[PDB]
């Protein structure tokens, strides 16, 4: 774990075991850990994409780390998906663990599928970012974003470093997940990975431009004209 140092507003990285006499550390308050979002690199943030970057393994314990500051997220997720047999696919969050508090669009996902045993670990080993903490696994019903953690040494300086989209999973990861976008409990639109969080809201706004929720069992799934 290298420590970056910001010097003259320039990021340089110091060797861990070097006698770097240019680095002056008068207080532990100069040492910070920062959680960064996987948005910075342009990676897609839609639901199928997120599902495809997650997976499971049993026999490996979860690990948790703390952080001081982080990036604002445009997108985050809240997963509470049940197993096909009715049990949960995910563990309970530990006491003191709360979801990520700084997100514009959350993709809340439920529904069902044939979830394997083990923990829901990130495919590239990225951490799930939670409220001032991060961990290697996904917890049930807890909001999180995906990210990485950098460690910095700061000079003395003063830098200081919403809506819900509801989706329903179907067979969760077995080749494909037949996700539906929920408009109401009866009205669904089959999800297609072209629709951004903004398009989904705009589509929802249009649907209720001349409408409202009513009552019972229509259970109709709509497709978008591909044009």
């Amino acid at each position: 774990i290298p420590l970056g140092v910001v010097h003259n507003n320039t990021l340089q990285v110091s060797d861990i075991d070097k006698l770097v006499c240019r680095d002056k550390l008068s207080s532990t308050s100069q040492l910070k850990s920062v959680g960064l979002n996987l948005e910075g690199n342009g990676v897609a943030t839609d639901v199928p994409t997120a599902t495809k970057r997650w997976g499971f393994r049993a026999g490996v314990p979860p690990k948790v780390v703390n952080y001081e500051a982080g990036e604002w997220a445009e997108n985050c997720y809240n997963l509470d998906i049940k197993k096909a047999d009715g049990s949960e696919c995910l563990p309970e969050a530990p006491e003191g663990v709360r979801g990520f508090p700084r997100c514009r669009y959350v993709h809340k996902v439920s529904g069902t599928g044939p979830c394997p045993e083990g923990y829901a670990f990130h495919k590239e080993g990225a951490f799930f970012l939670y409220d001032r903490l991060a961990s290697t696994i996904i917890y049930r019903s807890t909001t999180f974003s995906e990210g990485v953690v950098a460690f910095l040494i700061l000079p003395e300086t003063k830098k200081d470093f919403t809506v819900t989209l509801n989706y329903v999973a179907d067979n969760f990861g077995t080749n494909m997940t037949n996700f539906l976008f929920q408009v109401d409990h009866l009205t669904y639109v089959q999800l297609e990975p072209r629709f951004t969080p903004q398009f989904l809201v705009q589509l929802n706004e249009t649907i209720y431009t001349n409408g409202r929720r009513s009552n019972t069992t229509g259970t109709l799934i709509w497709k978008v004209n591909p044009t």
């Epitope: 431009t209 001349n210 009513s214 019972t216 069992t217 229509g218 259970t219 004209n225 044009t227």
Partner: antibody
């Protein structure tokens, strides 16, 4: 409601496609009503095929026509269109257009309905 | 998904008599039904919707009521101009359904 206007009847060789259309009046209908279609095969009532919500450009259809009938419309003229591909003898029917209050996924009906037109083969 | 039947297939109504159409759903939907008048060769016209509410331009002679799965539609003093096939449409769920209609003969 609108004046529902339908295209002329025709006979194709089996396996051919028919483009069925209804250039009904009503611009406001793009947000107030779905464009709906049925297939009234001889001896049958008004079997549901599908419906369009032009303000969203959203569509839905019966499983019976998946891979067989394209459901669309020209939003600027409010003209309903269908592509009855690989048309067969079992598709002999009077095809009709109508205006059903926006559906979402709740209970709905039309007050008006067109005269429809015959589409058949051989 | 919803299910509706046809009953009677044909009803005999001398003009001036009250005609009856019997709509029997498999679902408790008497509040989500619609009835249409279809003259031979003509488009069906909505007469009544929901339960008993009349459609625009429909004579008072057209009336009906129901509860749960069943609704009875009647036409008081049915006239020559009303010898139409009357259809029971159920619009409660998707796919929507219908009876095949009741023909009326003198």
């Amino acid at each position: 409601q609108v004046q529902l206007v339908q295209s002329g009847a025709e006979v194709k060789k089996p396996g051919s496609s028919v483009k069925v259309s209804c250039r009904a009046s009503g611009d406001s209908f793009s947000r107030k009503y779905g464009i709906s279609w049925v297939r009234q095969a001889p001896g049958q009532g008004f079997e549901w095929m599908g419906t369009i919500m032009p303000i969203v450009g959203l569509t839905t259809s019966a499983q019976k026509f998946q891979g067989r009938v394209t459901i669309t419309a020209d939003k600027s003229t409010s003209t309903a269109h269908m592509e009855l591909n690989s048309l067969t003898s079992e598709d002999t029917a009077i095809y009709y257009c109508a205006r059903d209050e926006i559906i979402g996924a709740r209970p709905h009906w039309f007050d008006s309905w067109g005269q429809g037109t015959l589409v058949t083969v051989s | 998904e919803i299910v509706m039947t046809q009953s009677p297939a044909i009803m005999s109504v001398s003009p001036g008599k009250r005609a009856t159409l019997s709509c029997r759903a498999s679902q408790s939907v008497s509040s989500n039904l619609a009835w249409y008048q279809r003259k031979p060769g003509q488009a069906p016209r909505l007469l009544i919707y929901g339960s008993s509410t009349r459609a625009t331009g429909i004579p008072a002679r057209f009336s009906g009521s129901g509860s749960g799965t069943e609704f009875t539609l009647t036409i008081s003093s049915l006239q020559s101009e009303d010898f139409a096939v009357y259809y029971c449409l159920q619009y409660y769920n998707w796919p929507r359904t219908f009876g095949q209609g009741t023909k009326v003969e003198i």
